[PDB]
A = this chain, B = another copy of it.
């Protein structure tokens, strides 16, 4: 049971760069790369006593990549695996998908090939990218397309970072987002949205860190990814692998967009006071005050929910709490799924990172659900796309690169078709 993780863009490689710090800490690997079976899903033992990760950071601008190449984890990552171009796509989907991808994707994929050939029981892929940028959006889509034509049958977990409604750092990210989804629909099997404002409000409210840099965000996102793969890495009382989300969370081949949530995100002082039990963290995983996407699930209806439990959890009280949730009437399910849940329990508790702000708690919950609020989000991005496109603003950069108006109109109607699908499914 082995899974490889590729990182596309400047956001993706900063996230996984927090992830791999978490992984080496969870498996007791000092950053030089040697130990002082459970690891084998990430680190492949090779060379001399070296556990080198199954991962490739790939990006066009060398600033952040060589930053990694000089950082603390110089000796961890295989040198060949960090692919770095010479010049950026510069927040331009056409530039990342047609100009520069055409030289970079073949090298990326035929690395991927020899990583998969070293692999034996490959479970699937998982990608890290933010669709607002240029490289993570453009050549990411090109990479997923050629990976799908390479394997197809293997499940691909896409942990994307969408732009927030009001807090935003670019101008053309509506164009990048729309063009990124148009391929994320028919290539990714399971795609998890995580914007930045939701994490901002979490870090402000629960973790009471008020000037949060990007690491605090990346740190707790790494906690979420580690939490939903701990079932593969460690034996639990009730384990679920990466193929389960494929079956149990995707009721229709085009409705695959999953809100994430985590609990308890609690500091050291708030831990010494709250009593940490199972019923209240199950409650805490359901209010929009602890979701990783700024959306209102009260306006939506759930399709299917999944609950990962880590640490000291017995099946009795998780069944009890889930009973309480289903008997509450504040939140509601669709008329299709009376069995709207899927629980999972693992033994190993979540670990602490020194310098991080999360205390060592006995247990934790990672909720991954499916709803119609995501359908509200896509319409929100669709409106602000149409406004800028009505004046043909910024279009000349894409046309100058080599793209045209055809795919703009057809990607627009594709999101309109997705909207009509969500409105048809919700009824």
Please report A residues at the B interface, Cβ cutoff 8 Å.
44-47, 50, 52, 78-80, 110, 114, 117-118, 269-270, 272-276, 279-280, 283, 287
Q: A114 contacts which chain B residues (CB < 8 A)?
A: 280, 283
Contact assessment for A46 and B269 in the assembled complex, using a CB-CB cutoff below 8 Å: no
Q: A270 contacts which chain B residues (CB < 8 A)?
A: 79-80
Contact assessment for B46 and A274 in the assembled complex, using a CB-CB cutoff below 8 Å: yes
Contact assessment for B80 and A275 in the assembled complex, using a CB-CB cutoff below 8 Å: no
Q: A276 contacts which chain B residues (CB < 8 A)?
A: 46-47
CA distance A280 to B270 in the complex (A): 50
A40 to chain B, nearest CB (A): 13
Q: A287 contacts which chain B residues (CB < 8 A)?
A: 110
A326 to chain B, nearest CB (A): 15
Pick the contact of A272: B44, B47, B80, B283 (CB < 8 A). Answer: B47
A382 to chain B, nearest CB (A): 31
Q: A283 contacts which chain B residues (CB < 8 A)?
A: 114, 117
Chain A to chain B contacts (Cβ below 8 Å), 16 pairs: A45-B275, A46-B272, A46-B274, A46-B276, A47-B275, A47-B276, A50-B272, A50-B273, A78-B273, A79-B270, A79-B273, A80-B270, A110-B287, A117-B279, A117-B283, A118-B280
CA distance A79 to B266 in the complex (A): 12
CA distance A117 to B321 in the complex (A): 11
Q: A269 contacts which chain B residues (CB < 8 A)?
A: 79
CA distance A79 to B46 in the complex (A): 49
Pick the contact of A273: B46, B110, B273, B280 (CB < 8 A). Answer: B46
Pick the contact of A52: B79, B110, B273, B279 (CB < 8 A). Answer: B273
Contact assessment for B275 and A44 in the assembled complex, using a CB-CB cutoff below 8 Å: yes
Q: A80 contacts which chain B residues (CB < 8 A)?
A: 270, 273-274
Contact assessment for A275 and B117 in the assembled complex, using a CB-CB cutoff below 8 Å: no
A409 to chain B, nearest CB (A): 38
- Determine the residue in chain B with the shortest Cβ distance to A45: B275
Q: A274 contacts which chain B residues (CB < 8 A)?
A: 46, 78, 80
CA distance A287 to B114 in the complex (A): 11
CA distance A46 to B44 in the complex (A): 42
A57 to chain B, nearest CB (A): 14
| 8 A-B pairs with least C-beta separation | A46-B275, A78-B273, A52-B273, A79-B269, A44-B275, A117-B283, A79-B273, A117-B280
A101 to chain B, nearest CB (A): 20
A62 to chain B, nearest CB (A): 16
A28 to chain B, nearest CB (A): 20
- Determine the residue in chain B with the shortest Cβ distance to A274: B46
Given contacts A50-B273, A117-B280, 20 further A-B contacts (CB under 8 A): A45-B275, A46-B273, A46-B274, A46-B275, A46-B276, A47-B272, A47-B275, A47-B276, A50-B272, A52-B273, A52-B275, A78-B274, A79-B269, A79-B273, A80-B273, A80-B274, A110-B287, A114-B283, A117-B279, A118-B280
Q: A78 contacts which chain B residues (CB < 8 A)?
A: 273-274
Q: A275 contacts which chain B residues (CB < 8 A)?
A: 44-47, 52, 118
Q: A44 contacts which chain B residues (CB < 8 A)?
A: 275
- Determine the residue in chain B with the shortest Cβ distance to A44: B275
A178 to chain B, nearest CB (A): 35
Q: A110 contacts which chain B residues (CB < 8 A)?
A: 287
CA distance A280 to B117 in the complex (A): 7
CA distance A200 to B46 in the complex (A): 29
CA distance A52 to B274 in the complex (A): 8
CA distance A413 to B110 in the complex (A): 41
CA distance A230 to B279 in the complex (A): 30
A201 to chain B, nearest CB (A): 14
A1 to chain B, nearest CB (A): 18
